[PDB]
Amino acid sequence: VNFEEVRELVPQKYPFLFIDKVIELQKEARIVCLKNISGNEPFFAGHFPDFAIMPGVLIVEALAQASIILFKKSVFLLASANVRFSKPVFPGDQLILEIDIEKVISSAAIVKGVAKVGDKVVTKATLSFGVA
Amino acid sequence: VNFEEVRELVPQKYPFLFIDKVIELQKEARIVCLKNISGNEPFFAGHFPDFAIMPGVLIVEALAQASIILFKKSVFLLASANVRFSKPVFPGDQLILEIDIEKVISSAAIVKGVAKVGDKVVTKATLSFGVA
Amino acid sequence: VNFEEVRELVPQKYPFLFIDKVIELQKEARIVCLKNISGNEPFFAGHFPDFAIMPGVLIVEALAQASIILFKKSVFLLASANVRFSKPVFPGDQLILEIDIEKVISSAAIVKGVAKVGDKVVTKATLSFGVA
Amino acid sequence: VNFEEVRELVPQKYPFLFIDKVIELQKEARIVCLKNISGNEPFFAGHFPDFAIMPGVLIVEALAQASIILFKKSVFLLASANVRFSKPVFPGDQLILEIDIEKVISSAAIVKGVAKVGDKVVTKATLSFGVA
Amino acid sequence: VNFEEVRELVPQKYPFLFIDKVIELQKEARIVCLKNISGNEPFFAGHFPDFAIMPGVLIVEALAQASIILFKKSVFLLASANVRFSKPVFPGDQLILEIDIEKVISSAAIVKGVAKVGDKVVTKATLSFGVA
Amino acid sequence: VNFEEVRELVPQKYPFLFIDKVIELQKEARIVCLKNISGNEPFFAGHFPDFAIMPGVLIVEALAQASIILFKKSVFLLASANVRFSKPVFPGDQLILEIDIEKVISSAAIVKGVAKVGDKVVTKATLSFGVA
């Protein structure tokens, strides 16, 4: 799934769309997405002026947007997140977002997310969603 | 503490600085910050085009920045967050960010954060920080 | 009137829409609007780098946009403005915009506007509009 | 006076600096400035989506910034403005800003401003400043 | 051809639309376009912080967009460019873009472009396009 | 060479810095740089609204910035470019920029640049620089 298709699946748009493509998809099971980290993204100017580092909260949003793609190919709002920010992410990194469904029902979904650069884990989260 | 002082305390800057002022401060104990939610903030164009709603992850970042102000008046990176997104936040809302210290040591800090509009709770989190 | 409705009433959009909500409305008479002032608004980076202060001309535009909301719930272009900038406005302020109609005709309208923070008057203006 | 010098004279910066160069200067008397109107300026996206027209309030700010250049080559805040918006200004226009000093004292200045495209007058204003 | 018409002819939009108006048009032969250079354009903040100068590559894009207008009034992608950057372009300059068709076929077009400030040549290019 | 070092070598900054890291460097000979292509970069909103594709002219600028890094680790302005845009580049692509020096003298440098995604060539250029 290329960026043009991702844009239509994900309701978020610039400057708050943090998926570039889908790399792997097992419906009702798992998705793997890619987000290129570019020094030319607007949030880096503010985080931080002296040192560009990807904000952990935006890794969480990327994981949530990957989950939404997984849901839709099988209005979702993040209902909760339990996240550990293990390692920092920099311009030049290719961020890999892996989502595994834990449980889905008509009104909610609970997933486990792992963010990786290469195959070093940089972020792990459990996310829950509601069907607003 | 007005915006000009907040700007110097918090290393984040536009478009990733999400505190406007400090309202209440008990050093080593508690801080209460204010973030005005304005429809003229850049992230609303992307979240969402059809319906401007504050991203929950940016409420988390606001809570984290309030904590950093509390730490400094007593390089902090979010190390973990356990957050429940209870209620949505809209342009026109005055977001109140209340941080209570749980435990601080030379190398880490753990806090409980509550975000409110009026005195309706919209977000609750436990946050941990490292001293990078 | 919430932001979503304001967005559809006012033809201006980001980064030039300076109303968040309507607080009070007496058709053909008076409107009271709210604009949250946020340090995360794009114009503050340029006015001024050393010290964020709301440009008076953008308070005028906010007053004009409030007037347009009042007109429409009863293409308007600012035709004239006679304005006194009394007191400065800062990130964290809730700007209250009060418009009273002086005279409306098929082709023009003349209003008196008052901008307040709390109930301290920060700006007073007489505005006229044409029906372009 | 080219843009690089204008940038240092005027405390405003992007996206709120609305002078490109100084064309004519008689100290303590008169200044003539130029502002190119470009469709690639950020405010046009919001004013208006369907039809790009320069906001009159930003012509006022341009006139005020020209005045500040005149003052400095002989912290100024707009204290008042009495302005008539005669004719619209579009991308592609070269906006000419002519400022004539009415009266200056240690603490205030009052000027008359005329904005022109070609030699058609598009805006006329009387402006006053304080020495904040 | 004013900006509103240019916007509909050219598929590029803010912040990548670099034509303001069409000044002269001989279909299947020649076009002359105008791009105002404004210090309030977003790319100047990055090129360069210490000294605003128009990037030569964006003059090339302006020449390419002028060519596309000429094509359409008689999806084009730049296929090649052979360009000499003779003289620098600054905020305050009115950039004149002159395109002469060399050869057009159903699937490609080759043009010669000259960019001028006043009638000093600042850029000369040969451009080719494909019909993607 | 990571992004933080690239930022100090290259005078361009956001939104006109198009290198993320240096991958390979043989002084006075060759450099290989990486630019992540992210759908969250500001130029994609304008090129094109319906379909995000990297502008070829910005690949040229990326090649020029890679060359400048090579020069400095051994004020450069693009003096000329002879470029063939072979294949399109999309959000999600990792753009590889390979520069080989042809000839350097005290006042000028001539290089050959190749841009690749994977090891498919997307752009080839000959660039010349002056020492402004």
From TrEMBL, chains A, B, C, D, E, F:
GO terms for cellular component: cytoplasm; membrane. It is found in: Cytoplasm. One of its GO terms (biological process) is lipid A biosynthetic process. Its EC number is 4.2.1.59. Its main location: cytoplasm. One of its GO terms (molecular function) is (3R)-hydroxyacyl-[acyl-carrier-protein] dehydratase activity. InterPro entries: FabA_FabZ, HotDog_dom_sf. Keywords: Cytoplasm, Lipid A biosynthesis, Lipid biosynthesis, Lipid metabolism, Lyase. It is an enzyme of class 4 (lyase). Involved in unsaturated fatty acids biosynthesis. Catalyzes the dehydration of short chain beta-hydroxyacyl-ACPs and long chain saturated and unsaturated beta-hydroxyacyl-ACPs. PANTHER family: 3-HYDROXYACYL-[ACYL-CARRIER-PROTEIN] DEHYDRATASE. This is 3-hydroxyacyl-[acyl-carrier-protein] dehydratase. The lineage of its organism: Bacteria, Pseudomonadati, Planctomycetota, Candidatus Brocadiia, Candidatus Brocadiales.
